[PDB]
Amino acid sequence: ARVVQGSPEVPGITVRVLQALATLLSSPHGGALVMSMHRSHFLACPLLRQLCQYQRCVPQDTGFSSLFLKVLLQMLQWLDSPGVEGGPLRAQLRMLASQASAGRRLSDVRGGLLRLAEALAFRQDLEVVSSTVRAVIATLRSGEQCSVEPDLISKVLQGLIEVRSPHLEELLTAFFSATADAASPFPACKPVVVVSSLLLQEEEPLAGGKPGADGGSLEAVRLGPSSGLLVDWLEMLDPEVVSSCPDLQLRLLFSRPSFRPYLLTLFTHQSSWPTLHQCIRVLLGKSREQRFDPSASLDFLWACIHVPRIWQGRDQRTPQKRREELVLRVQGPELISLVELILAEAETRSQDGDT
Amino acid sequence: DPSQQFLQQSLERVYSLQHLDPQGAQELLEFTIRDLQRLGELQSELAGVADFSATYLRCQLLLIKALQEKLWNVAAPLYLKQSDLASAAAKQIMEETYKMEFMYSGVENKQVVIIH
Amino acid sequence: RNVELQQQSCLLISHAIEALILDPESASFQEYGSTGTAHADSEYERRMMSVYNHVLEEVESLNRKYTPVSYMHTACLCNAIIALLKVP
Amino acid sequence: DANSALMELDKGLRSGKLGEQCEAVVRFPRLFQKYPFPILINSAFLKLADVFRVGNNFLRLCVLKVTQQSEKHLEKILNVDEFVKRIFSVIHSNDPVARAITLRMLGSLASIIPERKNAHHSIRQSLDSHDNVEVEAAVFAAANFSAQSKDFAVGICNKISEMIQGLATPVDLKLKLIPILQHMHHDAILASSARQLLQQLVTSYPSTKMVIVSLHTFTLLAASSLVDTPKQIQLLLQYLKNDPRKAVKRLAIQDLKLLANKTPHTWSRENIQALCECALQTPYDSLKLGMLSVLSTLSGTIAIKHYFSIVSSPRSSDLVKLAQECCYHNNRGIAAHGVRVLTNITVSCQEKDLLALEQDAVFGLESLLVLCSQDDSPGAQATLKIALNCMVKLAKGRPHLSQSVVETLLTQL
Amino acid sequence: IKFLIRQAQGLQQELGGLHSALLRLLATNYPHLCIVDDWICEEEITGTDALLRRMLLTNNAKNHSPKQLQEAFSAVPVNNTQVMQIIEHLTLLSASELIPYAEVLTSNMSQLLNSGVPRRILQTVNKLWMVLNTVMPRRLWVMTVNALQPSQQKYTQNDLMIDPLIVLRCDQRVHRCPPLMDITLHMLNGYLLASKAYLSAHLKETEQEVTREELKNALLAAQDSAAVQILLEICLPTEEEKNLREVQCLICCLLHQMYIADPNIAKLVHFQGYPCELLPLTVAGI
Incomplete structure (x- = not known):
């Protein structure tokens, strides 16, 4: 009885009262048959009938659906869309569904004002979900997203991010190491709902220096909320705190931020002894630029000796006063620099006072 | 004084929420009564006023529960x-009025007239 | 609730016989209370409550019409019994 | 036989081998729950304490278990100072594992010695050492006392603040350390100090591990100390909106669920509004499911009446739009948790404009029914159960729609 | 046996005397399982930190598999962050779900010793190894020993219980990597007790008189003493030095536990005497 589908659809579109239930049951029967693989060739006929009806009078049907009968329209649309999702066999009806959705959205954008996307919201959600095409560039998409970011279009940015994510999930390619920083800074500054997914994708199969990019972004951008995500990435993708770019790493740890102590504790309890010794020597080394924050540096020095791994077993909190057990040998000029730096930061006295 | 401010907030919320079904009223009073008891135990300087208002709200809840009994739906x-819980409700509410009037130390004429 | 309902039926027959056959003026009590509110939890209870209301609305009307000689009072009692037994 | 059964274990405890000694030590809870007589309980614990004080460092573990098993019987001990002396006399032993066992045992005795200053001091001392296997036990004992005493918690909270903000102690132990701040509910000043500590700790350690631990601990704190719940909820909502970590968002949901389950009425209107806005913004189905579960839980309780309290049409209210869209969203779970809120609002709040929402709901119900008709999956039947429960609630609350729903249900039969 | 006895410890109300009898039999015949450092680590905390962390971080961990970890691990030097990420999600798993990964970790512990790996990998592997120790020690010890033999027989459990010093015949690079020295000492302390039990059972078996018993006792005394002696030899610096501070501290803890366990070892190690360059260390360490 597929022939009467178009006629009942118009009767259903205007007023059905009961025929809507029969139509839904028929469609559910076809969906169940398809799930069982029982050659249920009825959905396509309903889809074609719906497309023909929409082409006949898009405005009248759109108005009736989005103003009078929202429930029935939403139910039918949901049933149809799940049918397409289940029937991944060649997605023949996919093009028809996309065209019908586009036409309905075009009609509704003008016909529906008081009923602001009561069901057009579901229609738009279905369109967005279905439009997850696979990008084929993966190199100019980054530039497109960067251009959009200056344009500041929310929907465009969301679509571009969604497309790029499928591109990254696709076969890996040679990612550029120049525009990636700009894209990440802009996606961070703007509210990027898919920022975490984009970062994970771009960092997993990346043809460039992930630690360098992350360090530069963290050091430069004063991004508040995502800073935690950046810190976790920095730690995990760089198992050693100071691995690739010691200059930038030390600039980050010590300076003339907000999350500094976490990184610093990780450095204290996750650094090879040679790396730590070299860090001590370079940090306490003579430097007239005051390139190391003396407070952080001195706290780190004081923590190094008391790292519990070193006293892990000797008798505790019962020491002989004269007996000095352990110290840290240092050099002449290094000692001079140490004393000079401690005195220099002591001379801050912004508010603390002489006492 | 966040504690005292919160106490006033809860009391005035209960005051305000009276235009709704007795079913909801019972639950609101129960929530706020256990709230007030918890706050009274937590603090010590508010232990008087907290428990005083708690007993008052409990009195009102008992009256409402008595009124919404199934007895009124039969001739x-x-x-x-064996179902007319209002019988014991009256004695309990009266005893609570006595308790509140006498046991507590600082009571004003306004509160006394409320209780009476 | 079922047991309470059976007790209510028994007490109903007792009240009917006492207020209709015995001194009716002594009883002189009006069924002035909320009645018939659809709060019952089972069709059985609903049907019993309907029967009770029918019996009360009959007996209140028939309180003073005749003398205690029980001219038609027997009819009211019999109809109440039949109704009470009707719901199985 | 009650006295005889004791000496039969006594001779075993007197046996030479740790085999029989261990067998005896782990045999007591049986005798206790067999004979709860206080005299016998006290006699038993005296010998347990002695064998603990002079033990092979495994009899001590067995006795620690006995204490952790028979806790209800502890209060009925007539002689406490002797017992506690025996147990505490092995905290000065130089063995870093014998200190850890004893700190655990003390932690297991907070119920009967909650004010002992010497025990408090010894725990606060062992809390800052170099032996991991004893620091990880001092943490436990400290968390145990911080619940059954106050003057101990006041000192601890300061100790912990300092000892977190010192760059010492590895992150692994810093994780174990934070939860102690649950039991700061003794006083309003304690709660305020702990909250002030949080506001800095979260920003100072924006990891994922630390955030996951801290937010849950202090939502528990806000639940316990019912004076700052309005403040806690808005912080949770801000982190729900902003932080991109999927894990942090999921914790936010699983925490707001607890707060909405304990104290629903306190939820203001703008709180629900912001939660609904966040639920709208997200593109992620799992997070949307989470927010909708929270909203369904709120809807049943009194919060809905406050939300629709006047001194903006209900149609203008965003909650309605979210409910309607999720009522038809593809996912079965989201659809179910949507229809829940719709049914709850329709049954509870009765405004003039909402009547169309009655039709909307009733018609969505058959869509859910047909969707779940033939799935035959555990989640499918869970959603179906929820849907039918919503149907029953709607019908009973409103007899008007009973005839409508019944005929549909029959057609799906 | 270890798994079941832990389960029984957990459930005590039901099993009336079975728990007591089982624990006696364990402690009497299998002393290399009743080592307090093993059972104490089970109690962890009551902080629920692990539980809450797991409940919210396991989710769907992109279906990590032993073969997946093996793939990443075969090229770990080329990519270390991949290994870090995999084991980081491994740590959260419960004591049971980890068993399928026993071979992957233990079998391939050689190249971990290679210079360059940040010690976080080693610390996490040590933690995982302890978790697995709390579940299945018997198999695990043999796996670890045969994986840490120098670069190759396949020692058996019965073999090691005869001559436990086989534990110390390991890659000399082990003596300068703290996290793995810990595991080696754990195995050594376990297998010395195991050897005691094995000899005690063997003599009773073969009895089908005192001379044999005090021969057993003398052998055990000398065996413990020799273990201590090689351990001190480890503490001695090698000429190349002319990390070691952490290694000496761990050996100090182990020696302390042995000394408390038995005095005669203290009286014997000293009557043998040991290189006196070590006195300034031990006198304070122990």
């Missing part, structure tokens, strides 16, 4: 007790 001659 007069069919009264058969």
Whole structure:
């Protein structure tokens, strides 16, 4: 009885009262048959009938659906869309569904004002979900997203991010190491709902220096909320705190931020002894630029000796006063620099006072 | 004084929420009563006022629960007790009025007239 | 609730016989209370409550019409019994 | 036989081998729950304490278990100072594992010695050492006392603040350390100090591990100390909106669920509004499911009446739009948790404009029914159960729609 | 046996005397399982930190598999962050779900010793190894020993219980990597007790008189003493030095536990005497 589908659809579109239930049951029967693989060739006929009806009078049907009968329209649309999702066999009806959705959205954008996307919201959600095409560039998409970011279009940015994510999930390619920083800074500054997914994708199969990019972004951008995500990435993708770019790493740890102590504790309890010794020597080394924050540096020095791994077993909190057990040998000029730096930061006295 | 401010907030919320079904009223009063008891235990300087208002709200809840009894939905001659909880509700509420009037130390004429 | 309902039926027959056959003026009590509110939890209870209301509305009307000689009072009692037994 | 059964274990405890000694030590809870007589309980614990004080460092573990098993019987001990002396006399032993066992045992005795200053001091001392296997036990004992005493918690909270903000102690132990701040509910000043500590700790350690631990601990704190719940909820909502970590968002949901389950009425209107806005913004189905579960839980309780309290049409209210869209969203779970809120609002709040929402709901119900008709998956039947429960609630609350729903259900039969 | 006895410890109300009898039999015949450092680590905390962390971080961990970890691990030097990420999600798993990964970790512990790996990998592997120790020690010890033999027989459990010093015949690079020295000492302390039990059972078996018993006792005394002696030899610096501070501290803890366990070892190690360059260390360490 597929022939009467178009006629009942118009009767259903205007007023059905009961025929809507029969139509839904028929469609559910076809969906169940398809799930069982029982050659249920009825959905396509309903889809074609719906497309023909929409082409006949898009405005009248759109108005009736989005103003009078929202429930029935939403139910039918949901049933149809799940049918397409289940029937991944060649997605023949996919093009028809996309065209019908586009036409309905075009009609509704003008016909529906008081009923602001009561069901057009579901229609738009279905369109967005279905439009997850696979990008084929993966190199100019980054530039497109960067251009959009200056344009500041929310929907465009969301679509571009969604497309790029499928591109990254696709076969890996040679990612550029120049525009990636700009894209990440802009996606961070703007509210990027898919920022975490984009970062994970771009960092997993990346043809460039992930630690360098992350360090530069963290050091430069004063991004508040995502800073935690950046810190976790920095730690995990760089198992050693100071691995690739010691200059930038030390600039980050010590300076003339907000999350500094976490990184610093990780450095204290996750650094090879040679790396730590070299860090001590370079940090306490003579430097007239005051390139190391003396407070952080001195706290780190004081923590190094008391790292519990070193006293892990000797008798505790019962020491002989004269007996000095352990110290840290240092050099002449290094000692001079140490004393000079401690005195220099002591001379801050912004508010603390002489006492 | 966040504690005292919160106490006033809860009391005024209960005051305000009276235009709604008795079913919801019972639950609101129960939530706020256990709230007030918890706050009274937590603090010590508010232990008086907290418990005083708690007993008051409990009195009101008992009255409402008595009024919403199934007894009123059956004819007069069919009264058969074993369900008319209002019988004990009256004694409990009166005893609570006595308790609140006398046990607590600082009481004003306004509060006394409320209780009476 | 079922047991309470059976007790209510028994007490109903007692009240009917006492207020209709015995001194009716002594009883002189009006069924002035909320009645018939659809709060019952089972069709059985609903049907019993309907029967009770029918019996009360008959007996209140028939309180003073005749003398205690029980001219038609027997009819009211019999109809109440039949109704009470009707719901199985 | 009650006295005889004791000496039969006594001779075993007197046996030479740790085999029989261990067998005896782990045999007591049986005798206790067999004979709860206080005299016998006290006699038993005296010998347990002695064998603990002079033990092979495994009899001590067995006795620690006995204490952790028979806790209800502890209060009925007539002689406490002797017992506690025996147990505490092995905290000065130089063995870093014998200190850890004893700190655990003390932690297991907070119920009967909650004010002992010497025990408090010894725990606060062992809390800052170099032996991991004893620091990880001092943490436990400290968390145990911080619940059954106050003057101990006041000192601890300061100790912990300092000892977190010192760059010492590895992150692994810093994780174990934070939860102690649950039991700061003794006083309003304690709660305020702990909250002030949080506001800095979260920003100072924006990891994922630390955030996951801290937010849950202090939502528990806000639940316990019912004076700052309005403040806690808005912080949770801000982190729900902003932080991109999927894990942090999921914790936010699983925490707001607890707060909405304990104290629903306190939820203001703008709180629900912001939660609904966040639920709208997200593109992620799992997070949307989470927010909708929270909203369904709120809807049943009194919060809905406050939300629709006047001194903006209900149609203008965003909650309605979210409910309607999720009522038809593809996912079965989201659809179910949507229809829940719709049914709850329709049954509870009765405004003039909402009547169309009655039709909307009733018609969505058959869509859910047909969707779940033939799935035959555990989640499918869970959603179906929820849907039918919503149907029953709607019908009973409103007899008007009973005839409508019944005929549909029959047609799906 | 270890798994079941832990389960029984957990459930005590039901099993009336079975728990007591089982624990006696364990402690009497299998002393290399009743080592307090093993059972104490089970109690962890009551902080629920692990539980809450797991409940919210396991989710769907992109279906990590032993073969997946093996793939990443075969090229770990080329990519270390991949290994870090995999084991980081491994740590959260419960004591049971980890068993399928026993071979992957233990079998391939050689190249971990290679210079360059940040010690976080080693610390996490040590933690995982302890978790697995709390579940299945018997198999695990043999796997670890045969994986840490120098670069190759396949020692058996019965073999090691005869001559436990086989534990110390390991890659000399082990003596300068703290996290793995810990595991080696754990195995050594376990297998010395195991050897005691094995000899005690063997003599009773073969009895089908005192001379044999005090021969057993003398052998055990000398065996413990020799273990201590090689351990001190480890503490001695090698000429190349002319990390070691952490290694000496761990050996100090182990020696302390042995000394408390038995005095005669203290009286014997000293009557043998040991290189006196070590006195300034031990006198304070122990």
